[PDB]
Amino acid sequence: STHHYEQLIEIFNSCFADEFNTRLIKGDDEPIYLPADAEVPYNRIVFAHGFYASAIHEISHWCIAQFEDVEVKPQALDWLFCVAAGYPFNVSRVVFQRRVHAQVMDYLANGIPERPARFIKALQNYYYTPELTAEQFPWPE
Ligand SMILES: [Co+2]
């Protein structure tokens, strides 16, 4: 499959534009969260640059809502999303990515929270990818 940020906009909106009144928007240099208002009546997650990886990262952060500690769970969702989509994962070293790996394992063993779980299933149906298995997430070596 190809991977274009425009695809993530449609997948995200399909998952969340109704239930959570939230949509994904390609922005400029800044990631932003803009709540619905009287003119634009839906919440907007704005990601920086027309870059697939950047959209994934803002989606992960939205799902979760000392920099290492705060970044572990969003980067774990990043990794899950990328494998679900058939996209290559990188962080943005080995010690930190092992913390992310453990958190992916935690999620897979103990349960993925509702919003990322929904996004993962939609990714799988959009890109026709097999069910996730821990084996698709190699320990950082
Ligand atoms: Co981040």
Numbering used by the authors: 3 to 67, 93 to 119, 131 to 179
What did the study's authors say about this model?
A recent study revealed that the β-lysylated Lys34 of EF-P is subsequently hydroxylated at C4(γ) or C5(δ) by YfcM.
In order to confirm that an Fe(II) ion is coordinated by the putative 2-His-1-carboxylate motif of YfcM, we prepared crystals of Co(II)-bound YfcM and calculated the anomalous difference Fourier map, using the data set collected at the peak wavelength of the Co K-shell absorption edge (1.6049 Å). The Co(II) ion has an ionic radius similar to that of an Fe(II) ion and can adopt the geometry of an octahedral complex together with six ligands, similar to an Fe(II) ion. Therefore, a Co(II) ion often binds to the 2-His-1-carboxylate motif in a manner that mimics an Fe(II) ion. In this structure, six atoms participate in the Co(II) ion coordination (nitrogen atoms (NEs) of His59 and His63, two oxygen atoms (OEs) of Glu98 and two oxygen atoms of two water molecules; distances from the Co(II) ion are summarized in Supplementary Table S5), which may mimic the Fe(II) ion coordination.
